Design a protein around this motif. Structure first.
Motif, PDB file in Angstrom:
ATOM      1  N   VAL A   1       0.887  -1.151   0.000  1.00 19.63           N
ATOM      2  CA  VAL A   1       0.000   0.000   0.000  1.00 19.63           C
ATOM      3  C   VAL A   1       0.938   1.217   0.000  1.00 19.63           C
ATOM      4  CG1 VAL A   1      -0.280   0.041   2.536  1.00 19.63           C
ATOM      5  CG2 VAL A   1      -1.939   1.152   1.104  1.00 19.63           C
ATOM      6  N   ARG A   2       0.787   2.068  -1.007  1.00 24.31           N
ATOM      7  CA  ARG A   2       1.639   3.247  -1.135  1.00 24.31           C
ATOM      8  C   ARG A   2       0.837   4.514  -0.949  1.00 24.31           C
ATOM      9  NH1 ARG A   2       5.947  -0.142  -4.431  1.00 24.31           N
ATOM     10  NH2 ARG A   2       7.477   1.550  -4.421  1.00 24.31           N
ATOM     11  N   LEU A   3       1.202   5.274   0.074  1.00 27.61           N
ATOM     12  CA  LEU A   3       0.533   6.523   0.396  1.00 27.61           C
ATOM     13  C   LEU A   3       1.471   7.716   0.093  1.00 27.61           C
ATOM     14  CD1 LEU A   3      -0.660   4.971   3.746  1.00 27.61           C
ATOM     15  CD2 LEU A   3      -2.274   5.887   2.138  1.00 27.61           C
ATOM     16  N   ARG A   4       1.870   7.874  -1.170  1.00 24.63           N
ATOM     17  CA  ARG A   4       2.789   8.956  -1.514  1.00 24.63           C
ATOM     18  C   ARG A   4       2.268  10.333  -1.192  1.00 24.63           C
ATOM     19  NH1 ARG A   4       6.138  11.623  -6.575  1.00 24.63           N
ATOM     20  NH2 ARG A   4       6.218   9.554  -7.562  1.00 24.63           N
ATOM     21  N   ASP A   5       3.132  11.121  -0.566  1.00 21.71           N
ATOM     22  CA  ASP A   5       2.821  12.492  -0.190  1.00 21.71           C
ATOM     23  C   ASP A   5       4.126  13.282  -0.341  1.00 21.71           C
ATOM     24  OD1 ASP A   5       2.130  14.896   1.020  1.00 21.71           O
ATOM     25  OD2 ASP A   5       1.039  13.941   2.664  1.00 21.71           O
ATOM     26  N   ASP A   6       4.237  14.039  -1.427  1.00 23.12           N
ATOM     27  CA  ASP A   6       5.448  14.810  -1.677  1.00 23.12           C
ATOM     28  C   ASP A   6       5.607  16.051  -0.804  1.00 23.12           C
ATOM     29  OD1 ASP A   6       6.409  12.929  -3.525  1.00 23.12           O
ATOM     30  OD2 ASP A   6       5.487  13.937  -5.234  1.00 23.12           O
ATOM     31  N   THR A   7       4.562  16.416  -0.068  1.00 20.13           N
ATOM     32  CA  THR A   7       4.639  17.575   0.813  1.00 20.13           C
ATOM     33  C   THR A   7       5.362  17.258   2.134  1.00 20.13           C
ATOM     34  OG1 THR A   7       2.500  17.277   1.972  1.00 20.13           O
ATOM     35  CG2 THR A   7       2.466  18.427  -0.155  1.00 20.13           C
ATOM     36  N   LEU A   8       5.543  15.973   2.453  1.00 20.90           N
ATOM     37  CA  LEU A   8       6.244  15.591   3.691  1.00 20.90           C
ATOM     38  C   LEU A   8       7.770  15.651   3.477  1.00 20.90           C
ATOM     39  CD1 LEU A   8       4.025  12.604   4.973  1.00 20.90           C
ATOM     40  CD2 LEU A   8       3.919  15.016   5.564  1.00 20.90           C
ATOM     41  N   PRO A   9       8.541  15.949   4.542  1.00 21.40           N
ATOM     42  CA  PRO A   9       9.999  16.041   4.438  1.00 21.40           C
ATOM     43  C   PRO A   9      10.760  14.726   4.433  1.00 21.40           C
ATOM     44  CG  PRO A   9       9.380  16.446   6.668  1.00 21.40           C
ATOM     45  CD  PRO A   9       8.085  16.334   5.894  1.00 21.40           C
ATOM     46  N   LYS A  10      10.049  13.628   4.659  1.00 18.58           N
ATOM     47  CA  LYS A  10      10.701  12.327   4.698  1.00 18.58           C
ATOM     48  C   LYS A  10       9.939  11.227   3.959  1.00 18.58           C
ATOM     49  CE  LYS A  10      12.762  13.071   9.364  1.00 18.58           C
ATOM     50  NZ  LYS A  10      13.321  12.361  10.575  1.00 18.58           N
ATOM     51  N   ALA A  11      10.539  10.044   3.953  1.00 16.61           N
ATOM     52  CA  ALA A  11       9.949   8.859   3.370  1.00 16.61           C
ATOM     53  C   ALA A  11       9.931   7.892   4.539  1.00 16.61           C
ATOM     54  CB  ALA A  11      10.817   8.311   2.245  1.00 16.61           C
ATOM     55  N   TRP A  12       8.741   7.440   4.915  1.00 18.51           N
ATOM     56  CA  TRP A  12       8.600   6.483   6.012  1.00 18.51           C
ATOM     57  C   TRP A  12       8.116   5.178   5.402  1.00 18.51           C
ATOM     58  CZ3 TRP A  12       7.325  11.617   6.528  1.00 18.51           C
ATOM     59  CH2 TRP A  12       7.791  12.315   7.657  1.00 18.51           C
ATOM     60  N   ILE A  13       8.858   4.109   5.633  1.00 19.30           N
ATOM     61  CA  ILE A  13       8.467   2.831   5.086  1.00 19.30           C
ATOM     62  C   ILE A  13       8.605   1.722   6.125  1.00 19.30           C
ATOM     63  CG2 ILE A  13      10.154   3.661   3.282  1.00 19.30           C
ATOM     64  CD1 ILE A  13       9.349   0.030   3.295  1.00 19.30           C
ATOM     65  N   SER A  14       7.811   0.667   5.945  1.00 20.96           N
ATOM     66  CA  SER A  14       7.806  -0.519   6.809  1.00 20.96           C
ATOM     67  C   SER A  14       7.675  -1.695   5.849  1.00 20.96           C
ATOM     68  CB  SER A  14       6.608  -0.500   7.771  1.00 20.96           C
ATOM     69  OG  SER A  14       6.727   0.530   8.749  1.00 20.96           O
ATOM     70  N   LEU A  15       8.486  -2.728   6.046  1.00 20.27           N
ATOM     71  CA  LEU A  15       8.469  -3.885   5.159  1.00 20.27           C
ATOM     72  C   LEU A  15       8.643  -5.138   6.015  1.00 20.27           C
ATOM     73  CD1 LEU A  15      10.766  -3.957   1.989  1.00 20.27           C
ATOM     74  CD2 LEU A  15      10.503  -5.996   3.382  1.00 20.27           C
ATOM     75  N   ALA A  16       7.929  -6.214   5.677  1.00 20.66           N
ATOM     76  CA  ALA A  16       8.011  -7.444   6.468  1.00 20.66           C
ATOM     77  C   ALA A  16       7.520  -8.710   5.773  1.00 20.66           C
ATOM     78  CB  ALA A  16       7.232  -7.261   7.784  1.00 20.66           C
ATOM     79  N   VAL A  17       7.964  -9.854   6.283  1.00 18.67           N
ATOM     80  CA  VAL A  17       7.525 -11.145   5.773  1.00 18.67           C
ATOM     81  C   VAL A  17       6.541 -11.674   6.816  1.00 18.67           C
ATOM     82  CG1 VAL A  17       9.639 -11.852   4.536  1.00 18.67           C
ATOM     83  CG2 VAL A  17       9.403 -12.196   7.040  1.00 18.67           C
ATOM     84  N   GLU A  18       5.870 -12.781   6.510  1.00 14.17           N
ATOM     85  CA  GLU A  18       4.975 -13.364   7.497  1.00 14.17           C
ATOM     86  C   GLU A  18       5.860 -13.904   8.623  1.00 14.17           C
ATOM     87  OE1 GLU A  18       1.232 -16.403   7.806  1.00 14.17           O
ATOM     88  OE2 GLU A  18       2.902 -17.009   6.517  1.00 14.17           O
ATOM     89  N   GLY A  19       5.609 -13.427   9.839  1.00  8.82           N
ATOM     90  CA  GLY A  19       6.387 -13.844  10.989  1.00  8.82           C
ATOM     91  C   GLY A  19       5.836 -15.020  11.777  1.00  8.82           C
ATOM     92  N   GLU A  20       5.998 -14.958  13.096  1.00  7.31           N
ATOM     93  CA  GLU A  20       5.559 -16.025  13.985  1.00  7.31           C
ATOM     94  C   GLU A  20       4.424 -15.656  14.949  1.00  7.31           C
ATOM     95  OE1 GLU A  20       8.535 -18.170  12.097  1.00  7.31           O
ATOM     96  OE2 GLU A  20       6.889 -18.887  13.340  1.00  7.31           O
ATOM     97  N   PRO A  21       3.492 -16.592  15.180  1.00  7.13           N
ATOM     98  CA  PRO A  21       2.389 -16.326  16.102  1.00  7.13           C
ATOM     99  C   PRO A  21       2.876 -16.678  17.511  1.00  7.13           C
ATOM    100  CG  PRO A  21       2.119 -18.477  15.202  1.00  7.13           C
ATOM    101  CD  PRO A  21       3.271 -17.852  14.445  1.00  7.13           C
ATOM    102  N   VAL A  22       2.229 -16.137  18.542  1.00  7.83           N
ATOM    103  CA  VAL A  22       2.618 -16.465  19.918  1.00  7.83           C
ATOM    104  C   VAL A  22       2.381 -17.973  20.081  1.00  7.83           C
ATOM    105  CG1 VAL A  22       1.985 -14.182  20.748  1.00  7.83           C
ATOM    106  CG2 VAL A  22       0.336 -16.036  20.897  1.00  7.83           C
ATOM    107  N   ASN A  23       3.333 -18.646  20.717  1.00 11.66           N
ATOM    108  CA  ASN A  23       3.295 -20.101  20.916  1.00 11.66           C
ATOM    109  C   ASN A  23       3.924 -20.875  19.758  1.00 11.66           C
ATOM    110  OD1 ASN A  23       2.049 -21.359  23.533  1.00 11.66           O
ATOM    111  ND2 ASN A  23       0.670 -19.630  23.082  1.00 11.66           N
TER     112      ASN A  23
END
Ligand code: CN6
Ligand code: CN6
Ligand code: HEM
Ligand code: HEM
Ligand code: HEM
Ligand code: 6PH
Ligand code: 9PE
Ligand code: 9PE
Ligand code: UMQ
Lengths: 431, 55, 352, 125, 352, 125, 55
Positions: free
Chosen positions: A223-245
């Motif tokens: 999901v890309r929420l591009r906003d050129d008015t902001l001073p930075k680029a904030w990104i988060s990336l991940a694979v399917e991880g582990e469930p508790v237990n």
């Protein structure tokens, strides 16, 4: 970290701390945002806010009590804080608020004002909290059309469509005895809190079981929420991880610890023993980043979040990070695993043994609601010390190497290349 | 930065053939250029090898 | 060389070396800041890099914090490794290298960042102003380095000499065996330090009232008030701050923040009104001061202030307690005021 | 070859009365025949700088010495292009041919070697 | 609609249109600055480019200066082209385009520049500070636009309507024949301008005394004092200023600048001490105050100030002249003070 | 061709009842056959922008319309790359196909024209 | 900007042959490179022309 748990219909769990100075008593339900629908989404955040309502808070303030409520994905809490002796009065407020104020707090004046508050509250978050807003969209795209995708605070659209009836229906289905655990942390003793609970009686809203639905599923997407008015680029990336237990719960956390967190502005942070740092500091690819191994009931997310002003070298930031991740499958070193063990312990320590009773209440409740009893550090440390390089490689070989990814980002992300280019870097070429 | 961007020779390959920003919507008609490159190479390679037996 | 500690059967411990070298003691504006940013850099025997890499392998981290009163060198780690961290903190105070290149490559850039973050928040600017007008050179010293007064490497080393002494510090251990902590401190270079003179003043500092200063600022506007409090008169100001912030006061939703900064020789009550637009900041602070002039309290916030004030588990050097069991009323006399932001449309002290 | 290595060897010779009296006279002659002083350069000005160590060393060099190093270099290039040497009285003298940059180079190297050792520390359980 | 002119057989002339719309009348901070900066931009029938190119071929240039009191549109040109410039200036007041792009492309940047230049001169920050503390919103408005209070394109147009009116301006000529000037003025779009009021106040402005403000600043330190003066009391302050800025005072070399800003309803006396280091500034400001508190004058500088007041032949309506022959003694009563720069090492009004 | 020129000829036809009844229908037909509305673009979105006049105009265009233009362009490239058209309810309607940029273009063109004339004015003494 | 710096083709000529910053002290030994370029051109041109009469 030491537990004690008994039952008599209502399951009670405590954890004494002779050097506490205060005590916290409360109730935690095994239902959070992941137990809402896309249309009543935010109903829990709504409950949290009326419990902390101005009126309700005054009634507690006069009693020398402080209120606390945390809405997560799997659990939900309502905790009361007081001095070690005033514990008897905290349970009275809890009993009063959740077994008598079924229409006191839901008045047209209190509700419409609270609704109005959480509405501006969420509008601000979505407007200014870029790193958390991005991380929330990460969950939203990774587990789309699945329980885990709904934002804990809820959406402005469904938030403004909520009425007292929505609050009640949620309460009737989730604020049940079979889906709760009375928690007491601080200095108070176990075989003393249960007495005050037995002092009263009734069973209003009991016998019923909570509702069920479809399980959380990870989907490679973005999901890309591009906003050129902001001073930075904030990104988060991940694979399917582990469930508790999960058998690899600690292995995954050790893996995240290997790459850790970083703040380019703090001298000591630049000196950590993380190889990735040698690649990103030459051209200063980011202001900060942090790896994580998020774990929930049905699934998890293993990855990282970053913030950067170097909008023309985002491809290098991502390239270098994912290239380091590949190493977990093919070349992670013994020393890297040993440094991670030490620091994981340290972080688990600061989490499970802070001087704060409300933190321990949430951890105690949320955990007993799943495994039946909070895990001791001594046992956690033993599992951590047993992790081998092979454990890490075997784990990375299944959750990281050439696996689908979930991406989310906002701000100046033009330099963030397409999905495939990012997905390609999840593996390396070989003979 | 990546070796493909920092190396004096690879950066040329990178800018023209790898990271080069293409309009997302160019259709198959835009494939003719790469085809002309192939033709030139085909023509040159075959010509040289024939040149070895020509008078 | 006070050494206290409170044991427990945990996995993690906390070591702190409190030094009375906060901004209040700064000889030049910002030197206390720079010195704080210099901690954990190279020592004559161990480099900053080695400290981090080794401590990571052990299972702990370091951090140096700046108060208006202290410079705290804290360390969090795995219980059984106490001596290493006692020696580590010791070396910092004793043999810090103070290399010229560290000032330009690490220290100044870090201080620039601290100031940059702080400058964007108007309440922090308001708080520096409050202190500066109520007091005028001790407690009134700017908290961070801003370059208006140039500080050399030498000045930093001088303040280190003046501040890092046996008599001017407390070794606080948390979740640590006091018997061992006292032993390790004496064995460390902590005790080899030149015995100095505790800079802590017993007598109450001079103060001023009815003072005002205005600072133009682009962004959120803020109106704040500061009131100097006596050593014995501080218990009531503490419950005032909790009252004004709890659901017991109708004007709590009109104030962003309110607290009482506690020192051994007194304190400063601070109340801030922050908002995107000046019209709102004006009506609020106006209503706050007006309502405070009507001396009220009754003390329904006594058991609340007791609970709130009890959340000091990490603090091993907290002030007077027994005082709360008294005083039920609060008036409002003379005070100090500051306007930050849209000054041209904010209230002056005259009209409050 | 690193300066740490060079200094080790040179110090051994310098500390040994036997080698010192046998080697130093040779080195003095080598330096005079080298002729860099006739162009107004100090030996430390000759160190090839296109590497990490030299750059951190040159960055750490105090301003006053950096301005002077700058001048000696420009002066040298100009003299060299005219195919002359500097007037006798402008030659660097043995006492002026001081190792001003060496301490900075040695500090950088010691820091870099430590980082290399720490980036590859092995752990014995 | 005032129209004056002093002729002469010169080759050059200079038209001026004094509009009472300086910073003192600004409804919003900097709005006067922006309007002044908007002058000479596009008009509905002639572009800024056309104006410049055309006036160049004629032999004339324009300019719009901003004061604390006025916004003056001025023209310098070859005498015989008078009507052209009368109309050009007329068109500016009557039909300036105020296009959104001109605001972002030319006006905002120019004002940004004006501010940037002034921001580096501490005596101007002090002068603004002085006015602010003694006239809390009258003439105490910030001279330039700084963005602390947002001014929209509409705010600028609104201010143009409020100030560009017949009863609020004075047309002035130099080396111009008054007969033709009045004729050309009536014949121009000046007469078509709506004749509003005239915020030129007669009653003396509300003033304040004993007030002080301090601003931290990097660079030179400056200590200044301000004194509000009557419509009649401004005669002795005119000589005071010159006396202190002449060889007659044994402390003229101790002060950077001193002057008397004159207005029709009063004035403000300002004295500034500026130097690289705060210690020098402090000594001077103290020595200046003490010697003035122990008042002395006796008018040995009455003939001097009479000459200096005369070397200002441009104001075709300057204040009281012969008021010099009167009062001769002077003693420093109450005043206002500002400290800019190394504030933590500058004197407080308290110790003066 | 300049928009000033296009407008001059277009206005002339549009004002003339005879020409207007004859041409406009043919033009309406032309625009529907053009098909850009089916891609979700307004005509002004089609103007080649790689020239100073258009850069000036696009700079002056208010923020909100500029974001709107960007969307229509991005959405169009995507639709075109998939070889589809947008669903009818997303087609730009005739009422919506407004010359939003045109006034900015004409303004920029007039300014450049004047600047060109002033740069080449002759003088008559 | 000067046309020699702005034009796509001339800017290469300008950076290598016109504005290229050369060390002030390079001596005649640094003239061999250009001489080698001359040699290549001499070989190619004379060779092509002879090739026209070769079997
Ligand atoms: C005698 C010497 C001849 C030498 C020349 C040989 C090379 C010929 C090149 C052909 C060419 O340039 O034609 C381009 C047009 C434009 O097409 P477009 O608008 O971009 O495509 C939309 C695609 O279906 C997208 O679809 P796609 O998902 O990319 O697959 C497309 C299609 C491509 O087939 C080709 O090889 C292209 C010609 O693959 C298939 O489904 C075919 C299965 C048998 O394609 C056509 O319309 C062809 C008719 C002219
Ligand atoms: C061999 C068959 C194929 C090759 C054919 C081409 C030959 C060219 C290769 C020769 C070469 O590169 O020699 C370089 C040396 C170094 O020289 P330097 O230290 O940089 O010069 C200082 C200049 O005199 C300054 O002086 P100048 O003002 O530049 O004039 C210099 C001189 C240059 O003469 C030449 O043609 C250059 C070799 O002109 C003269 O006044 C003398 C004319 C005969 O020049 C020498 O003097 C040689 C010394 C051994
Ligand atoms: C742009 C590249 C080239 C083009 C368009 C081209 C075209 C042609 C054409 C049309 C012919 C006659 C084909 C026939 O009917 O037999 C031909 C012949 C020939 N070409 Fe090329 N040529 C190219 C490059 C080369 C090169 C680089 C060489 C030399 C190394 C070469 C060597 C020859 C030879 C040997 C023949 C004679 C054999 C034959 O008839 O094919 N060609 N070329
Ligand atoms: C046809 C062959 C060649 C051509 C046209 C060529 C051309 C050049 C040119 C124009 C320069 C810059 C000016 C100069 O230093 O003379 C240069 C520099 C250089 N060339 Fe070559 N060259 C050729 C072959 C070689 C060979 C065979 C070597 C080494 C095995 C070589 C090594 C160098 C080096 C190292 C430099 C840099 C010298 C310095 O700046 O100190 N070149 N060459
Ligand atoms: C650029 C490097 C070149 C070098 C170093 C070179 C060198 C040589 C040499 C050593 C010979 C023998 C000369 C003799 O003893 O007769 C030769 C012959 C020849 N070369 Fe080249 N050559 C070059 C390029 C070319 C090119 C581009 C052509 C083009 C076809 C060419 C065409 C010929 C021909 C036709 C001969 C035979 C006639 C003769 O003896 O000169 N050469 N070349
Ligand atoms: C002058 C121009 C002539 C030709 C122009 C055509 C341009 C296309 C070149 C094809 C190179 C493909 C390399 C892909 C790569 O490196 O990605 C590698 C993957 O490569 C592969 O999977 C190999 C597939 C087989 C390639 C087919 C060879 C093409 C036949 C050559 C005919 C051309 C004359 C990166 O893969 P990953 O991103 O999943 O990690
Ligand atoms: C008609 C030609 C038009 C001219 C355009 C030239 C474009 C070349 C396109 C093909 C690029 C493929 C080869 C590049 C090799 C990359 C490796 C490299 O540069 O390693 C080099 C060393 O290379 C060599 O020693 C030999 C290179 C021979 C190349 C033979 C073709 C490492 O160089 P490096 O960038 O790391 O330098 C760091 C600063 N000390
Ligand atoms: C193996 C090749 C190695 C690398 C090749 C690059 C080396 C460049 C050497 C060539 C020097 C000659 C350059 C002359 C071109 C300068 C004028 C120009 O570019 O005008 C061009 C038009 O050129 C043409 O139409 C013909 C191209 C010439 C082809 C020459 C064979 C104008 O282009 P312009 O830079 O002005 O674009 C901005 C104005 N709107
Ligand atoms: C010029 C004409 C010459 C053409 C010659 C043909 C070249 C064929 C190369 C074929 C395979 O090269 C091979 O590609 C696959 C990807 O497809 C690589 O696989 C890599 O990416 C894939 C994902 O897509 C991963 O699953 C895999 O674990 C990883 O190793 C493999 O490591 C490499 O060895």
């Amino acid at each position: 970290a030491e537990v004690t748990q008994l039952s008599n219909g209502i399951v009670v769990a405590t954890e004494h701390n002779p050097s506490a100075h205060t005590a916290s008593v409360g109730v935690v339900f095994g239902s959070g945002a992941a137990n809402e629908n896309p249309y009543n989404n935010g109903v829990s955040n709504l409950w949290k806010n009326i419990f902390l309502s101005k009126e309700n808070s005054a009634v507690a303030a006069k009693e020398g009590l402080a209120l606390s409520s945390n809405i997560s994905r799997d659990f939900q809490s309502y905790i009361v804080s007081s001095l070690p002796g005033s514990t008897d009065k905290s349970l009275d407020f809890l009993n009063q608020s959740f077994i008598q104020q079924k229409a006191n707090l839901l008045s047209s004046s209190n509700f419409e004002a609270t609704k109005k508050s959480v509405l501006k509250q969420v509008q601000d978050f979505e407007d200014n909290d870029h790193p958390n807003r991005v991380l929330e969209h990460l969950h939203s795209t990774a587990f789309q059309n699945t329980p885990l995708s709904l934002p804990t605070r809820g959406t402005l659209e469904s938030l403004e469509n909520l009425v007292v009836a929505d609050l009640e229906s949620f309460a009737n289905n989730h604020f049940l005895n079979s889906n709760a655990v009375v928690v007491g942390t601080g200095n108070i003793k176990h075989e003393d809190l249960v007495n005050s609970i037995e002092s009263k009686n009734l069973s209003l809203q009991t016998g019923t079981k909570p509702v069920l639905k479809k399980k959380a599923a990870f989907l490679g997407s973005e999901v890309r929420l591009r906003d050129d008015t902001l001073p930075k680029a904030w990104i988060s990336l991940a694979v399917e991880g582990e469930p508790v237990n999960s058998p690899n719960y600690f292995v995954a956390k050790l893996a995240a610890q290997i790459f850790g967190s970083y703040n380019a502005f703090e001298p000591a942070s630049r000196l950590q023993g993380i190889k990735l740092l040698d690649n990103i500091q030459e051209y200063q690819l980011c202001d900060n980043f942090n790896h994580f191994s998020l774990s929930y009931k049905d699934s998890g997310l293993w990855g990282f979040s970053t913030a950067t002003r170097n909008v023309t070298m985002i491809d290098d930031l991502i390239h270098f990070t994912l290239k380091q991740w590949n190493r977990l499958t093919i070349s992670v070193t013994d020393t890297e695993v040993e440094r991670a063990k030490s620091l994981l312990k340290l972080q688990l320590g600061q989490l499970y043994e802070s001087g704060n009773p409300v933190n321990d209440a949430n951890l105690l409740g949320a955990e007993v609601l799943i495994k039946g009893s909070k895990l001791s550090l001594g046992e956690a440390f033993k599992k951590i010390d047993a992790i081998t390089v092979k454990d890490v490689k075997a784990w990375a070989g299944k959750r990281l190497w050439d696996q689908d990814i979930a991406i989310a980002g906002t701000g100046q992300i033009e330099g963030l290349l397409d999905y495939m280019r990012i997905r390609s870097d999840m593996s390396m070429m070989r003979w | 930065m990546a070796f493909r961007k920092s190396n004096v020779y690879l950066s040329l390959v990178n800018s023209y053939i790898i990271d080069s920003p293409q309009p997302s919507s160019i259709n198959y008609w835009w494939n003719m250029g790469s085809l002309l490159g192939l033709c030139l190479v085909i023509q040159i390679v075959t010509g040289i090898f024939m040149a070895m037996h020509y008078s | 060389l006070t050494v206290s500690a409170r044991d427990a059967p945990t996995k993690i411990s906390t070591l702190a070396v409190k030094v009375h070298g906060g901004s209040r003691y700064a000889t030049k504006d910002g030197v206390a800041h720079l010195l704080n940013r210099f901690n954990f850099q190279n020592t004559n025997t161990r480099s900053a890099l080695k400290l981090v890499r080794e401590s990571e392998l052990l299972g702990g981290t370091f951090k140096s914090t700046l108060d208006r009163e202290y410079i705290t060198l804290k360390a969090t780690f795995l219980k059984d490794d106490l001596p290493y961290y006692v020696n580590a903190l010791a070396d910092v105070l004793y043999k810090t290298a103070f290399k010229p290149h560290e000032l330009t490559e690490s220290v100044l850039p870090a201080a620039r960042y601290d100031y940059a973050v702080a400058e964007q928040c108007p309440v922090k600017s308001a708080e520096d102003q409050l202190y500066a007008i109520t007091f005028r050179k001790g407690l009134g010293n700017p908290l961070l380095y801003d370059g208006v007064e140039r500080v050399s490497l030498q000045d930093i080393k001088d303040f280190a000499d003046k501040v890092y002494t046996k008599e001017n510090l407390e070794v606080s251990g948390e979740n640590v065996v006091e018997a061992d902590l006292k032993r390790f401190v004496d064995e460390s270079l902590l005790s080899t330090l030149p015995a100095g003179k505790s800079l802590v003043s017993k007598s109450e500092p001079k103060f001023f009232l009815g003072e005002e200063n205005r600072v133009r600022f682009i962004g959120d506007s803020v109106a704040a008030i500061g009131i100097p409090v006596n050593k014995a008169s501080l218990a009531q100001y503490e419950v005032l701050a909790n009252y004004l912030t709890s659901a017991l006061s109708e004007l709590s939703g009109l104030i962003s923040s309110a607290k009482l900064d506690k020192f051994t020789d007194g304190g400063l009550f601070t109340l801030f009104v922050r908002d995107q637009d000046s019209a709102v900041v004006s009506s609020n602070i106006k209503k706050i001061v007006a309502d405070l002039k009507k001396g009220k309290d009754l003390s329904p916030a006594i058991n609340y202030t007791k609970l709130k004030n009890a959340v000091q588990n990490e603090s091993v050097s907290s002030p007077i307690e027994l005082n709360f069991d008294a005083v039920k009323d609060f008036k409002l006399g003379k005070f100090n005021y500051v306007a930050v932001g849209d000054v041209s449309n904010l209230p002056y002290l005259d009209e409050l | 070859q690193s300066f740490t290595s060079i200094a080790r060897i040179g110090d051994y010779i310098l500390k040994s009365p036997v080698l010192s009296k046998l080697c130093v006279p040779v080195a003095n002659q080598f330096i005079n025949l080298a002729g860099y002083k006739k162009l107004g350069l100090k030996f430390d000005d000759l160190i090839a700088e296109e590497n990490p160590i030299m750059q951190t060393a040159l960055r750490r060099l105090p301003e006053d010495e950096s301005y002077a190093r700058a001048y000696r270099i420009i002066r040298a290039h100009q003299t060299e292009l005219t195919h002359h040497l500097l007037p006798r009285n402008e030659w660097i003298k043995a006492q002026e041919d001081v190792p001003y940059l060496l301490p900075y180079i040695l500090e950088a190297e010691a820091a870099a070697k430590e980082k290399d050792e720490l980036d590859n520390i092995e752990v014995s359980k």
